[PDB]
């Protein structure tokens, strides 16, 4: 009956509007988190590239001093592998962040403001199109999560390699410092 | 009513699909925050450890230079280099409440005005669904590209570490041969 037909429209409208407002907040939150990740990723890329450049300069400085010692002892040439080829890439997802913020705003226009057969067949078609697109989107999110687990392993491997480097340095250079200490007590300063 | 039923179901079906996409989005964002911050802490550890070793190598070179002659050293300070960390927990949490809270928005139950109202309801739902699907597509695009680069910089970090291991091996090896030559005279 007539009132039930309008009152329903009010429920469909009130519920739908509630979902839009919530979805808008989620879209803004996704845009905010994406922008923050973009920033720290690119900052960290620049920290690494600054590190590599300064290490090259420092290794050359060690290389020069060693040869001077060697030629002094003589009275050879040493090279250390260049690490200049190591480069950290930057990421650019600004276009996606913009679309998210744009649709977040666009949804204001999709809210239902009610006035106080063919359509059904057309409606069957639109949902199918959405179901096909939302499926491809969900598949992309799944494979990305799989890449994120594969990534966790890789970050663990260089956590291992980093600790291995640390102890190799403490062992080699601590031992040199002790051995040199005994040679220095035996020899006279120039 | 038949159209009223059809839209009410289609909505409910799509809300659930959105919910799952929101939950995977918070999940990928949570994983990214962790490996980004781990990779950041590794970089800062490497900087700190290298600075200490460059200082140790610096004193060792000058000490050797003070006992040989006639044929000064401070290495550049890299301790200022810092990798910042990220905090997006508030955004990830909000993504999770909204995905759960979408349960509340689910539904169950002249003649030109109602016909015009249903025409409006269908068109707004269709336009919003199309807009949301496009934004989720953008979210997926950004997450894959984010994974992509953080992986490349993790691999670059790994190759840097293994190159560093050889360079400091070569330095150490040369220093030990210099020590034995000095020991002899």
Author numbering:
A (entry chain A): 1 to 75, 82 to 122, 135 to 208
B (entry chain B): 6 to 76, 83 to 120, 133 to 208
What's written in the study?
The spike (S) protein mediates SARS-CoV-2 entry by binding its S1 subunit to the host receptor angiotensin-converting enzyme 2 (ACE2), and subsequently promoting viral and cellular membrane fusion by its S2 subunit, leading to the release of viral genome into the cytoplasm. The S2 subunit contains two important domains, heptad repeat 1 (HR1) and heptad repeat 2 (HR2), which are highly conserved among coronaviruses. Subsequently, three HR2 peptides move backward in an antiparallel manner and fold into the three surface grooves of the HR1 trimeric α-helical inner core, thus forming an irreversible six-α-helical bundle (6-HB) structure that maintains close contact between viral and cellular membranes and promotes membrane fusion. We designed a recombinant protein HR121 from SARS-CoV-2, which could highly mimic the conformation of the HR1 trimeric inner core in the fusion intermediate of the S2 subunit.
HR121 monomer consists of HR1–linker 1–HR2–linker 2–HR1 segments (linker 1: GGSGG; linker 2: SGGRGG). However, it was unexpectedly observed to be a dimer in PBS by Native-PAGE. X-ray crystal diffraction in 2.41-Å resolution demonstrated that HR121 dimerized into a stable asymmetric 6-HB conformation with a rod-like shape (115 Å length and 25 Å diameter). The HR121 dimer (or HR121) consists of a parallel HR1 tetrameric coiled-coil helix (the four HR1s were termed α1–α4), packed with two antiparallel HR2 helices. The three internal HR1s (α1, α3, and α4) interact with each other via hydrophobic residues located at the “a” and “d” positions. Furthermore, they bind two exterior HR2s and one HR1 (α2) packed at their three hydrophobic surface grooves using residues located at the “e” and “g” positions, commonly found in the 6-helix coiled-coil proteins. As such, the four HR1 helices in HR121 combine to form two sets of trimeric HR1s. The outer HR1 trimer (α2, α3 and α4) also bind two HR2s and one HR1 (α1), but its two surface grooves formed by two adjacent HR1s (between α2 and α3, α2 and α4) remain unoccupied. Notably, these two vacancies may provide two possible binding sites for exogenous HR2s, and are, therefore, expected to create efficient antigenic epitopes to elicit nAbs targeting the HR1 trimeric core in the S2 fusion intermediate. Using a GST pull-down assay, we observed that HR121 selectively binds to HR2, but not HR1, implying that HR121 is functionally analogous to the HR1 trimer inner core in the fusion intermediate conformation, and could interact with its counterpart HR2.
